[PDB]
């Protein structure tokens, strides 16, 4: 019996669902066919409307306290919650309903974890992360916009193998993936350490792969696996391809000033 996963979608861009299917180890194909039972998911499921909604009732009954709730996106509280409508009702009502009998909740991405772009000032929909709405259930936060594909399937794999949520840091993120700052093992560190920086795009320094701190790189204050695990089967990451980290796995990163403004107090990060 494969563990049922009910994958809900709130206010979102769908980057988390897309990242999931980029996983090389394991393949998303193998996750869906052999590891979980992906019983509700708006992006992939065959049923629509009344036939889709009826699945939730069936799974919650049959696997009470034995299904995982995965949430992509987040609930808005403004517009009486009707800036995100599902089956004619606010999304917050669906979220609360499915959460009550879940054995574990995964907040996929920065949207579910923290609020992400729709929660940036002035937050016209009062988009609210899942843990501020569901307060009586065990939640794992997997932040990033989106998180790395292998981090997402890594979390699932751990949960299915062990029937446990992995050890979390104090922000609710799994230590197995979010224990290092980007700046800890970033391959440009030897340049940072020698005070060798890009000062303008496509300068001689940029063509030599010098450090991106002075171009606004937020790697020194951002926790994720991008520098080591990297993206899309270890092909690259933001810094390797020439752009500073914008801090996308950190709470409120959209409202920490311009992405191209440098962190102050560089000595701090030596």
């Amino acid at each position: 019996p494969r563990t049922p996963v009910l994958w809900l979608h709130g206010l979102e861009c769908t980057c988390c669902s897309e990242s999931f299917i980029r996983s090389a180890h394991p393949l998303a194909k193998d996750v869906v066919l052999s590891m979980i039972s992906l019983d509700y998911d708006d992006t992939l499921m065959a049923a629509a409307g009344h036939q889709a909604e009826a699945i939730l009732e069936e799974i919650m009954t049959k696997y009470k306290g034995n299904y995982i709730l995965a949430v992509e996106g987040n609930p808005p509280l403004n517009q009486d919650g009707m800036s995100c409508i599902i089956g004619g009702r606010p999304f917050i009502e669906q979220l609360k309903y499915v959460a009550k009998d879940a054995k574990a909740i995964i907040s996929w991405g920065s949207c579910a974890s923290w609020g992400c772009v729709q929660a940036a000032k002035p937050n016209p929909t009062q988009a609210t992360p899942v843990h501020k709405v569901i307060t009586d259930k065990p939640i794992i936060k997997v932040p990033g916009c989106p998180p790395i594909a292998e981090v997402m399937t890594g979390v699932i794999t751990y949960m299915l193998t062990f029937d446990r949520i992995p050890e979390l840091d104090r922000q609710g993120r799994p230590k197995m993936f979010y224990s290092q700052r980007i700046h800890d093992k970033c391959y440009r560190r030897p340049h940072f350490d020698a005070g060798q920086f890009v000062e303008e795009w496509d300068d001689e320094s940029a063509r030599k792969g010098f450090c991106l701190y002075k171009m606004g790189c937020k790697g020194p204050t951002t926790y994720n696996a991008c520098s080591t695990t990297r993206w899309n089967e270890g092909t690259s990451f933001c810094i390797q391809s020439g752009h500073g980290c914008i801090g996308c796995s950190e709470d409120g990163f959209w409202d920490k000033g311009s992405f191209y403004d440098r962190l102050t107090g560089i000595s701090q990060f030596g």
Binding site: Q79, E233, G242, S258, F259
Partner: protein, 598 residues
């Protein structure tokens, strides 16, 4: 009941509600009315989400905007970033270097292919393919079908198909059907034979594995996928051949070329032939519904110029066609205040005067969630939405007051029209179309032992089958184009031009104290534009009009219907409680609801 655009709308019949519409991006509610014979006579498109990115952008730095707007959508990932950097560069009079141009084009065409192919197999296919009928297929006859549909596809043996069939059989017999749970399998809306269904399911699984390889092009140039990085003034991926320490070197470029060659093979051997074969079989069943506005009014901004900054060399040449007159393409100007305008008469927003449409440089986004008097249910529990009043988070874009369809089908109709008036840049899309028509009408029927048909492109293209076909052809053309772009990029680098960014106007102290700009993109789902005003280094106004905004739009002040609503009209449903035909036609637009509402 009223008449508009040659359609007779009537809401007297039985009301059917589909909420949620699944296998799309984001959130949509669709309602229809059917007559005594289950034919759709009214259709209502409701966008059921809004985030307010246009509001969030105010006061921020234009150089940062691309990152915010990129998060409008993770499916069409990067097309908003491109629009944004183009809009800011247009406002600030920045010309990007040739290598930045070519790298952006390669990224855009990679998105086109990834988005189109994933859409067809993972979102659309299940409206045409019965997965349960694939269980009953003969593996030998499936192999024989494969070899007829696509001789050059190497994965075609009977044992390969039987193996795929057995894995599916086991999955089903487990009692945990997952994504196939509560499906409409066995509906008479499904017409394919078992062998075709098994072929399609096999390709579903193939595409799901392969799609993660294609996006590695984005990862090289833009660091990650989804949501690769962009830059105002060029690209961040600096070039050096003669280190291991540059973002782009010859080894990285050779890797990109290998991914491009894989894409070309997939489009030619799997995707295009599947759509031609499935299209032929539904054509044989007489399922030519879903034309909607494509039969009359189509629009695209035009994209992919052979020569940078020279719109006459667009390889998907744009413009506007009205009233089904393919002999006259009107030019489209995103700067003209009397052309692209958005109404909110039937949308959950407010203007000073909702009898007028606003050009996006003058656009306003103020939410106004309120339901009409004829609503069944309450503000937080809608049973039947009231389309006489405000009924969607999607604005209503119009072109000189006309309702238009956008997307790959629109671009292919435009390309065909341009080609027939002597535009040689449109020659390849024209060739693709004529080849496709001959396959659908003659070659495939003859190979399958079906009678030959004599549909013109004028008849075949304005339909749900035609819309699905155009998407596949565009995928193929985009793959072919980025192959040429790669050669141009490598040639330019080898000739000594390594420039990737123009930083002359990077610092806001160099900017005009106020400015306005527009960036347009042929996004996977159609015509995308971003319109920006800048004041004293900050964003003063930022308005997006997105392809699914056009296609999914509610009615305007005159009561004219948009593309989704028009396309559902006059379609028979086998069972009005099973939305198979509704889903087939809606999915043919590849609705992106987060895009549509932003």
């Amino acid at each position: 009941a009223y008449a508009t655009q040659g359609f007779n709308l009537d809401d007297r019949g039985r009301r059917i509600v589909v909420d949620p519409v699944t296998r799309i991006e984001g959130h949509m509610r669709c309602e229809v009315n059917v007559d005594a014979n289950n034919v759709i006579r009214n259709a209502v498109s409701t966008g059921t989400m809004w985030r307010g990115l246009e509001v969030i952008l105010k006061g921020r730095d234009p150089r940062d905007a691309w990152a915010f707007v990129e998060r409008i959508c993770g499916v069409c990932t990067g097309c908003h970033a491109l629009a944004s950097v183009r809009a800011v560069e247009n406002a600030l009079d920045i010309r990007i270097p040739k290598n930045a141009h070519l790298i952006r084009e390669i990224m855009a065409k990679t998105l086109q292919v990834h988005d189109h192919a994933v859409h067809f197999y993972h979102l659309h296919a299940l409206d045409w393919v019965d997965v349960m009928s694939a269980l009953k297929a003969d593996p030998k006859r499936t192999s024989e079908l494969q070899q007829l549909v696509s001789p050059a596809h190497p994965l075609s043996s009977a044992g390969y198909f039987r193996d795929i069939q057995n894995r599916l059989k086991r999955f089903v017999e487990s009692g945990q059907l997952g994504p196939f749970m509560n499906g409409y399998w066995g509906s008479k809306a499904y017409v394919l034979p078992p062998e075709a269904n098994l072929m399609a399911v096999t390709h579903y699984l193939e595409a799901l594995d392969l799609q993660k390889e294609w996006v590695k092009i984005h990862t090289i140039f833009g660091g990650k996928n989804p949501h690769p990085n962009y830059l105002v003034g060029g690209v961040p991926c600096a070039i050096n051949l003669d280190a291991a320490s540059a973002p782009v070197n010859m080894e990285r470029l050779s890797f990109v070329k290998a991914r491009i060659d894989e894409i070309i093979e997939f489009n030619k051997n799997v995707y295009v032939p599947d759509v031609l074969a499935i299209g032929t079989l539904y054509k044989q069943a007489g399922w030519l519904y879903g034309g909607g506005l494509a039969a009359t009014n189509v629009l695209d901004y035009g994209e992919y110029p052979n020569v940078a900054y020279n719109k006459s060399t667009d390889q998907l040449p744009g413009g506007a066609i009205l009233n089904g007159n393919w002999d006259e393409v009107f030019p489209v100007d995103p700067r003209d205040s009397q052309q692209v305008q958005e109404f909110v008469s039937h949308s959950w927003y407010k203007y000073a005067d909702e009898s007028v449409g606003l050009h996006p440089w003058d656009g306003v986004t103020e939410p106004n969630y309120v339901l009409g008097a004829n609503t069944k249910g309450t503000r937080t529990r809608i049973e039947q939405i009231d389309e006489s009043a405000k009924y969607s988070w999607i604005k209503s874009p119009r072109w000189r007051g006309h309702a238009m369809e956008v997307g790959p089908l629109s671009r292919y109709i435009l390309a065909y029209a341009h080609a027939r008036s002597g535009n040689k840049y449109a020659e390849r899309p024209k060739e693709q179309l004529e080849y496709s028509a001959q396959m659908i009408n003659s070659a495939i029927p003859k190979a399958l032992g079906l009678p030959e048909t004599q549909y013109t492109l004028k008849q075949l293209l304005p339909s749900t089958i035609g819309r699905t076909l155009a998407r596949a052809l565009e995928s193929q053309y985009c793959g072919e184009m980025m192959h040429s772009d790669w050669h141009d990029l490598v040639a330019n680098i080898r000739a000594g031009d390594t420039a990737t960014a123009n930083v002359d106007k990077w610092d806001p102290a160099t900017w005009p104290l106020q400015a306005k700009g527009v960036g347009t993109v042929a996004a996977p789902r159609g015509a995308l534009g971003h319109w920006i005003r800048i004041k004293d280094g900050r964003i003063e106004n930022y308005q997006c009009v997105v392809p699914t905004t056009w296609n999914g739009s509610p009615r305007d002040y005159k009561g004219q219907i948009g593309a989704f609503e028009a396309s559902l009209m006059n379609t028979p449903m086998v069972n009005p409680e099973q939305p198979v035909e509704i889903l087939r036609t809606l999915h043919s637009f590849d609705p992106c609801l987060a895009c549509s509402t932003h």
